Amino acid sequence: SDTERPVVNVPSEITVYRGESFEYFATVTDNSNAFDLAKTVVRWLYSNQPGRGTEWLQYSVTQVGNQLKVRIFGNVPIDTTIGDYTRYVVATDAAGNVNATQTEMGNAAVDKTSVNGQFKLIIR
Ligand SMILES: [Ca+2]
């Protein structure tokens, strides 16, 4: 049995630059050492998508030993809007537990509080 949520480690903020490519990394651990990689995503609040203003945000997940490795990458178009956005690494263990639920992401967005796996995406 597994009732404990996986834990994301992600940089608190990632800064990207118009016209330029970027690459950052997050990792995930879980008590069971077993994951649901296809249900581990990088997304904005509203839907399982990179989000408005950040449609160029990409990711790829692999399992390395007992961890997931989440590569967060892309190329920022030269005419993207400059600003700061909250995004979420949402990981699922093999048993279906998630680090942050849809409910929690919504409360965090409105209340300006934090969940595990959240990060600031800063465009300059
Ligand atoms: Ca677990």
Residue 105 has what DSSP assignment? H
Residue 53's Cβ-count burial label (10 Å; 0-12, 13-18, 19+) is middle
Closest CA to 87 of 120, 47, 62: 120
Method of structure determination: X-ray
Which residues contact residue 123 at a Cβ distance below 8 angstroms, ignoring those fewer than 6 apart? 15, 16, 17, 18, 53, 54, 76, 80, 81, 82, 83, 84, 85
What domains appear along the chain, each with residue ranges and CATH number?
Answer: 1-124 (2.60.40.4140)
CA of 28 to the centre of ligand 1 (A): 11
The two three-digit tokens of residue 74, written as one number: 């892309």
CA of 80 to the centre of ligand 1 (A): 38
Q: How many CA atoms lie within 13 A of 112 on its CB side?
A: 0
What resolution in Å is listed for this PDB structure?
A: 1.0
Q: What is the spatial distance between Cα 83 and Cα 65, in angstroms, rounded to a whole number?
A: 36
CA of 34 to the centre of ligand 1 (A): 8
3-state secondary structure of 90: strand
The 10 Å CB-count burial string (b at 16+, else e) for 98-122 is: bbbeeebbeebbeeeeebbbbbebe
CA of 95 to the centre of ligand 1 (A): 7
The answer to whether residues 21 and 75 touch, using CB atoms and an 8 Å cutoff, is yes
